[PDB]
């Protein structure tokens, strides 16, 4: 069950720059006193992050796009940030991920939950006793067919509401690479009331969850102390981009500083010489400045269907000693239609990979056609021999094409 | 498990005895990517996962890095830089019964190709034409999950083939699943062939004093040297140096 929250005040959010935050360890192998260059999804230095904060009655938790990597930061005083939700549609139609820190444990659930617009954790405070006890928890309306579940070690927190300036800074990095959801984090005590501190961060790896789901939507849970109050909280959301860093490792195995390779010409020289100190002179720089963000596709402007139905169901189908060559022209080759009703045994492709077959445009295409027995399917290949590839049908050594074979015991063979 | 929603099981804190498996089970295609089958025994693996799905005989080739089809674009895609072994065998007697086994399903139609190791469980209606289906079946509106028709009277292409795909990560992070090789004594300060946690080589070892991180188990001060390693038996931090100094 969920309900709309009243007395909501609308104010435009602020944008501030992150002073060298959001970098993590790319690998778990130990090194020391060396400089390592890496290419991974990283938040670029001095980028706009979203200053979201509470107190009048300032409450905010919008739905943000994921955009292949999210860096999160939070200035914490009295345990307001409790978790996040990730997904695609957030309405139990797609797979969803939920990370929450409830009153005694930490729960990570990958399931098809249905979500309301304003999820919250409600903490209630009593006049008669000074103890703060968790009372309310509304993030999902109901449950469905669950896939992954994880419950941490039980513990207790500081549930009281401290006053004054914030005392902690907890940083997180979420990314999804090769079906793996990698979470990096570190927490540093701070003394600030409304500021993002100027200090380097070394986010250690925490979990590599093997979830492997589509993800494009993100939202942050909050805790509040139909009257209600929001309390004091502030968090920061930024997005990771494909960049190149150079990390300097100290003698203790922890990283010291990271030199961007696409921010400054001095940083460009530091990247192209792979060192943090450069002398005077002229240093030609390798090109790391620009990364394209758009794609354009232009093809011949004809959308007829190719006669694959004539080739693949030919009812009378050619022999092997006198095979048929059919020219295909002025149409489109929709491969997705072919395997709807036909199963191919050996889809061997020479010179062209099957993955990059869709985006190509063919110029001189011909469709050979013959019937062979099951033992001679291997003979239709460049470099094979036998009584089929020597006397009946020989393929060239520099072949470029795809061999498509299937079973036709029901069609091409009859009794007697 | 089915192929649209396959199962991932984590295996940890045990030993992987390969010799038990082929005592009573015969594997059709033991394709291995990145790791040779001969050197599988002396390795000790770190992060393993056992995928599980049933496919027909013609689509066994589709579970491979770089292959395409309706099982490697819409159901289960393997990454390009895969490191592991694909274990498939015939299961016509177990997974197929008379009258058709309709429990197994697969995504016949999908809007876009899957990312590597990504699971899709949604059952939303796919629109074939430009008309909107609006969540109800009609013309050019089909259920995306079609059912297999496994029957014991069909051919080799139309019978189930249980596929278990293992994914490893060799010689990075601490390891929990090792091979069936037996451990021997350690001869330090002498030239000897070592097999520390699957890392084979020849060179002398001494005692080092640097401290590792809790999530780090190996170390290479300079790459292609492999100087640092921890002894699994004693948890003594050491160093790996070449057999003799080169200054002769």
């Amino acid at each position: 069950q969920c309900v709309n929250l009243t007395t909501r005040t609308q104010l435009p959010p602020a944008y501030t720059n992150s002073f060298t935050r959001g970098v993590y360890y790319p690998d778990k192998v130990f090194r020391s006193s060396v400089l390592h260059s890496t290419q991974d999804l990283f938040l670029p230095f001095f980028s706009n992050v979203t200053w979201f904060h509470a107190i009048t009655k300032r409450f905010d938790n919008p739905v943000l796009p994921f955009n292949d990597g999210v860096y999160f930061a939070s200035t914490e005083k009295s345990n307001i940030i409790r978790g996040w939700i990730f997904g695609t549609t957030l309405d139990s139609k797609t797979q969803s991920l939920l990370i929450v820190n409830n009153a005694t444990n930490v729960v990570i659930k990958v399931c098809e939950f249905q979500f309301c617009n304003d999820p919250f954790l409600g903490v209630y405070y009593h006049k008669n006793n000074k103890s703060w006890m968790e009372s309310e928890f509304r993030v999902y309306s109901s449950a469905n067919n669950c896939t992954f579940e994880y419950v941490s070690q039980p513990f207790l927190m500081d549930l009281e509401g401290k006053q004054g300036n914030f005392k902690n800074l907890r940083e997180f990095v979420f990314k999804n690479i090769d079906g793996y959801f990698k979470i990096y984090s570190k927490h540093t005590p701070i003394n600030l009331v409304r500021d993002l501190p100027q200090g380097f961060s070394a986010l250690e790896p925490l979990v590599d969850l093997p979830i492997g789901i589509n993800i494009t939507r993100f939202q942050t849970l909050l805790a509040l102390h139909s009257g209600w109050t929001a309390g004091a909280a502030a968090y920061y959301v930024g997005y990771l981009q494909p960049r190149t860093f150079l990390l300097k490792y100290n003698e203790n195995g922890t990283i010291t500083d990271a030199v961007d390779c696409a921010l400054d010409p001095l940083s460009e020289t530091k990247c192209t010489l792979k060192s943090f100190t450069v002398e005077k002179g002229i240093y030609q720089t390798s090109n790391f400045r620009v990364q394209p963000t758009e794609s354009i596709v232009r093809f011949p402007n004809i959308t007829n269907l190719c006669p694959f139905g004539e080739v693949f169901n030919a009812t009378r189908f050619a022999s092997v000693y006198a095979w048929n060559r059919k020219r295909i022209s002025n149409c489109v080759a929709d491969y997705s239609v072919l395997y709807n009703s036909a199963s191919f045994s050996t889809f061997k492709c020479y010179g062209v990979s099957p993955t990059k077959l869709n985006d190509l445009c063919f110029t001189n295409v011909y469709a050979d056609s013959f019937v062979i027995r099951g033992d001679e399917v291997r003979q239709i290949a460049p470099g094979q021999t036998g009584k089929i590839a020597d006397y009946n049908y020989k393929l060239p050594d520099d072949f470029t094409g795809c061999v498509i074979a299937w079973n036709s015991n029901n069609l091409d063979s009859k009794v007697g | 498990a089915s192929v649209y929603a396959w199962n991932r099981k984590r295996i940890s804190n045990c030993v992987a005895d390969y010799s038990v498996l082929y005592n009573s089970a015969s594997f059709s295609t033991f394709k291995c990517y990145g790791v040779s089958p001969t050197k599988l025994n002396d390795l000790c693996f770190t992060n393993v996962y056992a995928d599980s799905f049933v496919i027909r005989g013609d689509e066994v080739r589709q579970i491979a890095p770089g292959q395409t089809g309706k099982i490697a674009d819409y159901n289960y895609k393997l990454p390009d830089d895969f490191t592991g072994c694909v274990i498939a065998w015939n299961s016509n007697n177990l997974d197929s019964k008379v009258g058709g086994n309709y429990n197994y399903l697969y995504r016949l139609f999908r809007k876009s190709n899957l990312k590597p190791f990504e699971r899709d469980i949604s059952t939303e209606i796919y629109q074939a034409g430009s008309t909107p289906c609006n969540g109800v079946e009609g013309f050019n509106c089909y259920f995306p999950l079609q059912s297999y028709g496994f029957q014991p009277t069909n051919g080799v292409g139309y019978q189930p083939y249980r596929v278990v795909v293992l994914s490893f990560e060799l010689l990075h992070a601490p390891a929990t699943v090792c091979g069936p090789k037996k451990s021997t004594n350690l001869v330090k300060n002498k030239c000897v062939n070592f097999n520390f946690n699957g890392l084979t080589g020849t060179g002398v070892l001494t005692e080092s004093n640097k401290k590792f991180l809790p999530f780090q188990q190996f170390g290479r001060d300079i790459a292609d040297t492999t100087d640092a390693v921890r002894d699994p038996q004693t948890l003594e931090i050491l160093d790996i140096t070449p057999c003799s100094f080169g200054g002769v």
Epitope: S131, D158, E160 | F215
Partner: antibody, heavy 134, light 106 residues
Framework: QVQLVQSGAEVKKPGASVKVSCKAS????????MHWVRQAPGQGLEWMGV????????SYAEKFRGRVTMTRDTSTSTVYMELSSLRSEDTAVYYC???????????????????????????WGQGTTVTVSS | AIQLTQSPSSLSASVGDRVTITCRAS??????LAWYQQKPGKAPELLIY???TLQSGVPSRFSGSGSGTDFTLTISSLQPEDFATYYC?????????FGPGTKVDI
Amino acid sequence: QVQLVQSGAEVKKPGASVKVSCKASGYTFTSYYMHWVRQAPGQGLEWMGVINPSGGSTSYAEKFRGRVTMTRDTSTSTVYMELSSLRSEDTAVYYCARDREPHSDSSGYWDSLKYYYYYALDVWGQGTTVTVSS
Amino acid sequence: AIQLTQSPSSLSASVGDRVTITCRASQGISSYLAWYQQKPGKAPELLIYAASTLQSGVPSRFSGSGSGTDFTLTISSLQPEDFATYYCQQLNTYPFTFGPGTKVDI
């Protein structure tokens, strides 16, 4: 070394509340949890509650939930325990023991997934004797 | 809940020998174990934490081992001051439960 002093022996009718106090000395009051152990005469130990002193948050056993109030006084630096509806089987001795795991004034409980938590009752008090009878 | 059973309930030994005591768990506990020693008329003291690690300020004659549902404690060169009650405690989930207790006599 640290010295922990509990309250004296108290006798009362088993139909009212009891007041037990502990006062750890030589250790940061807020860091470690303050575990509570009841021992019956001629019986083994049992765990009844844990106190996160800085938070004031507490966790009871599932058998004794809702009948025991476990509070703190950080101004006078003591841990208080009160039990309602005493029975004849509650005639026992009470120990209040700190737990080994230390913490800071922060929810690094996020790091529960990095480092495993092992709790150990290393330092024990001298105990108090609570005897009730009709 | 989770219950732990120590076997045997009654133990008899001498001074200067090696003795072995064990306790069996119901479900999976992994490495969450506390071995506690309590002298009669005295408060209990922590002896072994995490089932394989010696606690500081304790002599190394005591040792502990075990995994899964089985746990054991080995006593070598048994001093006359070691005649005390032993408990094994599991810390998997709430609530934390103690063992029954083993008594050893001269």
